[PDB]
Amino acid sequence: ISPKKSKYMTPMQQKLNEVYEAVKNYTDKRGRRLSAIFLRLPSRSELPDYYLTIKKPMDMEKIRSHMMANKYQDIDSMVEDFVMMFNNACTYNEPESLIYKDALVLHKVLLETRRDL
């Protein structure tokens, strides 16, 4: 159960949402939306080994709900959560894996987007 969304979006929320959407909406040459696998982690019952391999689980739905509850006090705090999520993907998965490679690309999209705001 996620925190209740706020009525209007603060300016900070709008700025954060611009970053969130840039990462969510990014597509490769073949139009594949790289974010799909990062939207929601499987549960502990579904992927138990994962949760003992990384220190702090993160997915985009967690970030989104925190963002929509007006809980992020600045851009860097959300960027940190995206970095942790991509770092976690590169920890658990092999460098030869698609998920790992997509994590490197979206990490770049993330930092470029912040840079350009």
Reduced 3-state DSSP string for 21-55: HHHHHCECCCCCEHHHHHCCCCCCCCCCCHHHCCC
Task: Give this entry's resolution in angstroms.
Answer: 1.8
Structure tokens at 3: 């925190």
Type of residue at 47: L
d(CA 28, CA 109): 12
For residue 62, give every residue at least 6 positions away whose Cβ sits within 8 Å of its Cβ, in sequence order, or none: 81
d(CA 104, CA 95): 10
Second CATH level (architecture) for the domain 1-117:
Up-down Bundle (1.20)
Type of residue at 11: P
Type of residue at 89: A
Experimental method: X-ray
Tokens 């997509």 found at: 102
- DSSP 8-state class, residue 74: S
Q: What are phi and psi of 33, to 5 degrees?
A: -85, 105
